[PDB]
Enzyme design. Structure first.
Site, PDB file in Angstrom:
ATOM      1  CG  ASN A 153       6.002  -1.603  -1.245  1.00 48.89           C
ATOM      2  OD1 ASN A 153       4.912  -1.931  -1.824  1.00 48.89           O
ATOM      3  ND2 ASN A 153       7.091  -1.250  -2.009  1.00 48.89           N
TER       4      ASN A 153
ATOM      5  CG  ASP B 176       2.857   0.440   2.371  1.00 49.37           C
ATOM      6  OD1 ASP B 176       3.565  -0.518   2.065  1.00 49.37           O
ATOM      7  OD2 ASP B 176       1.771   0.694   1.809  1.00 49.37           O
TER       8      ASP B 176
ATOM      9  CG  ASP C   3       5.757  -3.142  -5.082  1.00 47.76           C
ATOM     10  OD1 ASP C   3       4.788  -2.905  -4.614  1.00 47.76           O
ATOM     11  OD2 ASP C   3       6.678  -2.537  -4.879  1.00 47.76           O
TER      12      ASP C   3
ATOM     13  CB  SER D 217       1.757  -3.144   0.554  1.00 45.38           C
ATOM     14  OG  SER D 217       2.513  -2.207   0.100  1.00 45.38           O
TER      15      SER D 217
ATOM     16  CG  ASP E 252      -6.162   3.843 -11.057  1.00 44.07           C
ATOM     17  OD1 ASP E 252      -7.313   3.461 -10.688  1.00 44.07           O
ATOM     18  OD2 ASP E 252      -5.552   4.516 -10.096  1.00 44.07           O
TER      19      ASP E 252
ATOM     20  CG  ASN F 297       1.404  -2.015  -3.556  1.00 41.72           C
ATOM     21  OD1 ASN F 297       0.540  -1.657  -2.667  1.00 41.72           O
ATOM     22  ND2 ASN F 297       2.664  -2.337  -2.845  1.00 41.72           N
TER      23      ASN F 297
ATOM     24  CD  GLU G 193       8.405  -0.885 -11.345  1.00 43.97           C
ATOM     25  OE1 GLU G 193       8.411  -1.537 -10.229  1.00 43.97           O
ATOM     26  OE2 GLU G 193       8.149   0.492 -11.379  1.00 43.97           O
TER      27      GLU G 193
END
Length: 129
Positions: free
Chosen positions: A46, A48, A52, A50, A101, A59, A35
């Site tokens: 990203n 969209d 990271d 957003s 989650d 995110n 990562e």
């Protein structure tokens, strides 16, 4: 800060990540490797809009507030910049919420594609934990 393999393994263990939710330490070290390459200051935007953040590339769309992600949820209650600290505690605490989650570690695409089903034990091989 750019962690060494065994150094991160030890920091993660200390903060209670080994076998958290059934995921062995090798899984978490492997995920950090792919990562962020063990770099706490890593950021990636990203499509969209957003972004990271950190060693575990959390995110901004759901987990943290960066002030520039319209409609972000900030489920971990922290500014995203807090995730870039040399102290991994905040990143680990938020990751614990993410992995709980429901989707497990599949939340991390690099884990799913590069770690999942591999001998993740190799990642902590040789370390004094």
């Amino acid at each position: 800060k750019v962690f060494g393999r065994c150094e991160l393994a030890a920091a993660m263990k200390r903060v209670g990540l080994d076998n958290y939710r059934g995921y062995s330490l090798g899984n978490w070290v492997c995920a950090a490797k792919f990562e962020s390459n063990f770099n706490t200051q890593a950021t990636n935007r990203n499509t969209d809009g957003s972004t990271d953040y950190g060693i575990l590339q959390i995110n901004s769309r759901w987990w943290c507030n960066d002030g520039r992600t319209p409609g972000s949820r900030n489920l971990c209650n922290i500014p995203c910049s807090a995730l870039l600290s040399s102290d991994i505690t905040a990143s680990v605490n938020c990751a614990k919420k993410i992995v709980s989650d429901g989707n497990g570690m599949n939340a991390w695409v690099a884990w799913r594609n590069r770690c999942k089903g591999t001998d993740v034990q190799a990642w902590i091989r040789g370390c004094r934990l």
